[PDB]
Amino acid sequence: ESGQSVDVCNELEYPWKLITANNCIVSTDESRQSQYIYRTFLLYNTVLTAILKQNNPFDVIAENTSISIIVRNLGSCPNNKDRVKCCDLNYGGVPPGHVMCPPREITKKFFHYAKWVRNPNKYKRYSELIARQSHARDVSQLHLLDWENFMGEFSSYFGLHAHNV
DNA sequence: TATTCCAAACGTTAAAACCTTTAGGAGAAGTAAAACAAAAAAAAATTTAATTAAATGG
């Protein structure tokens, strides 16, 4: 009851809603974290594309593309192996090196969440994917910790307040 | 001792395909009636003998 609950998937007018309702799903905190990670890594991909003097392999949503093979291509970042070796990439701006090296399993679960889009109607098959507890509690919570570490260090790297989420 | 990924079996959720149940139309044998013609059986009429009714007659 508390807060603004008027935003419901019954967004028609009294009779027309009485006839049919908007397509909708169940939202829960864990899928919300999945979405946060998703949007933030979309932002990260956009910034890479912007400062890149080469293509951005992390920007292709095709099928045969697999985060596994791309990871195998690029590999763990030197000063932090949990990250990825984006330091060697080619930027039109001066290479910041390690600065652009996100974690590993975070990107894995990001890609698996992304490949959801093929059939959104099977929403639950990936609704929670990134932050799933499939112990695994430690694994996924520390993955969230690593992701938010990347988020904050990026934000500080460009003066962005951590509160802009 | 204890990693590290790299590969690999397994479960579960959708898609797709498949069998199902019912519904509408299509001939198809089966029953039946339509009709056909002999056969049998009944009916109809026939003719004589017998009977009686009546006139002729001991």
Nucleotide nearest to A124 (CA to C1'): B13
Method: cryo-EM
Task: Provide CB contacts within 8 A for A49, sequence distance 6+.
Answer: A56, A59
A131 CA – B9 C1', rounded, Å: 24
Nucleotide nearest to A105 (CA to C1'): B5
Nucleotide nearest to A71 (CA to C1'): B5
A47 CA – B44 C1', rounded, Å: 131
Q: List the one residue out of A99, A109, A111 whose CA is nearest residue A57.
A: A111
A10 CA – B23 C1', rounded, Å: 40
A149 CA – B53 C1', rounded, Å: 160
Q: Is A123 exposed, middle or buried (0-12, 13-18, 19+ CB in 10 A)?
A: middle
Q: Rounded to the nearest 10 degrees, how much is the dihedral formed by the CA atoms of A39, A41, A43, A47?
A: -170
Q: Which tokens is A37 given?
A: 């990670």
Cβ neighbours around A103 below 10 Å, total: 23
Angle subtended at Cα A143 by Cα A152 and Cα A26, rounded to the nearest 5 degrees: 100
Q: List the one residue out of A16, A30, A3 whose CA is nearest residue A126.
A: A30
- Resolution (angstroms) equals 6.1
Specify which residue's alpha carbon is closest to the C1' of nucleotide B12: A125
DSSP string, A85-113: -GGGS-BSSPP-GGGG--BSHHHHHHHHH
Residue A76 CB-half CA count within 13 A: 6
Give the N- to C-terminal CA distance of chain A in Å, as an integer.
25
